[PDB]
Amino acid sequence: VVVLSFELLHAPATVCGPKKSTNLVKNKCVNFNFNGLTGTGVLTESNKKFLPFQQFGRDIADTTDAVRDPQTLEILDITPCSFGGVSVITPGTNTSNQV
Amino acid sequence: NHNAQALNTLVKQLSSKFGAISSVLNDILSRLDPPEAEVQIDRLITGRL
């Protein structure tokens, strides 16, 4: 009997899979994977003073807001892509069909 | 204050595990098989409902 006791978190970690790396992008709604954490959003530059030991940032609601890339030590802001409700203003279909 | 506090509590409820293994849906989706991922999402869905 041989047992493996991996521990998983939202952490950069040290042991990783054999998957290859890919260049990053800025100011475009993309889905990203950082050391096992998957999220869709816009990647922007950071003015946050990240401490050297720190890796991520969390907001008041405890959500990932900034991340430090493992391959290149830079801090990037995550901003979820734009969304919002849609309303349709129309008169009666009897009067017209324009909306 | 009542309105703001109710909204804050509703937002904070998203961080509860609700008996699952992780409070974030993406990790459950990317870490487990569908037959058990369905159970985990079931727990999260009922809690948030």
């Binding site: 907001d59 008041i60 609601a61 959500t63 | 909204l7 804050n8 937002v11």
Partner: peptide, 28 residues
């Protein structure tokens, strides 16, 4: 009475009431 000097055209008592009563992105 309304105060023409103020851009908001509010009475002094209304202005005081407006001033005396007073994270959003996370909820949004």
């Amino acid at each position: 009475l309304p105060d023409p000097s103020k851009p908001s055209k509010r009475s002094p008592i209304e202005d005081l009431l407006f001033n005396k009563v007073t994270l959003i992105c996370a909820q949004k």
